Amino acid sequence: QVQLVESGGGLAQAGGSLQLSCAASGSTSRVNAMGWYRQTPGKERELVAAIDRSGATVYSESVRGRFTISKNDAKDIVWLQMNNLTTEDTAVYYCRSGVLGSWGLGTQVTVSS
Ligand SMILES: CCC(=O)N(c1ccccc1)C1CCN(CCc2ccccc2)CC1
Numbered sequence: 001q002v003q004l005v006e007s008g009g010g011l012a013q014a015g016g017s018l019q020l021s022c023a024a025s026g027s028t029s030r031v032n033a034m035g036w037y038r039q040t041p042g043k044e045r046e047l048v049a050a051i052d053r054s055g056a057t058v059y060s061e062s063v064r065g066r067f068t069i070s071k072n073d074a075k076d077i078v079w080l081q082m083n084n085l086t087t088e089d090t091a092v093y094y095c096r097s098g099v100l101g102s103w104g105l106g107t108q109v110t111v112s113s
Contacts, residue, residue: 002026004095006107012085014113020080022095022104033098034078036069038091038109045094051078062088085111 008020024031035050049069051057057069066084071077082089094106 002028002031002097002099004097004104006093006095006104008080009093009107009109011110011112012082014086014111016085016111017081017083018085018109020082020093020107020109022078022080024076024078024097028076031097031099034069034071035096035098036078036080037094037096037103038089039094039106040091048093049080082109087111087113 003025005023006020008018010018012018022034033050033052036048037045038048039045047060048063049057049059049067051069051071059067068081070079070081078095080093089109090111092106092108094103096103
């Protein structure tokens with residue numbers, strides 16, 4: 001069992017930045033991938049960014065060059081650096097591993113302008 005804890009979020013303006021963290025606990029050596037997902041009302045949970053153990057990453061085209069996913073190997077934390085924020089980034093953000101299934105509670109992000 002691996003436990004994931006989302007922290008961060010907030011209310012931002014178009015152009016500002018937020019930093020979300022995802023802290024893993026438990027049998028983290030069986031985790032080879034970590035991803036951030038987001039959801040909006042009426043729409044479906046969609047991928048934002050993913051990172052694997054070697055540090056390679058993929059990004060949704062809507063957040064490429066604005067969002068950055070990174071990891072702290074010593075603290076078992078995956079960060080979502082949300083820069084250059086737009087109103088489209090308003091969503092509840094969720095952390096998940098490569099094993100499909102149990103989500104954390106997520107955290108909320110609102111971007112106004
Ligand atoms: C894509 C992510 C990834 O590869 N990980 C990760 C997972 C969740 C959240 C942050 C990072 C690793 C998990 C294992 N930790 C080391 C702990 C360890 C190592 C060796 C033996 C025993 C214990 C290194 C990072």
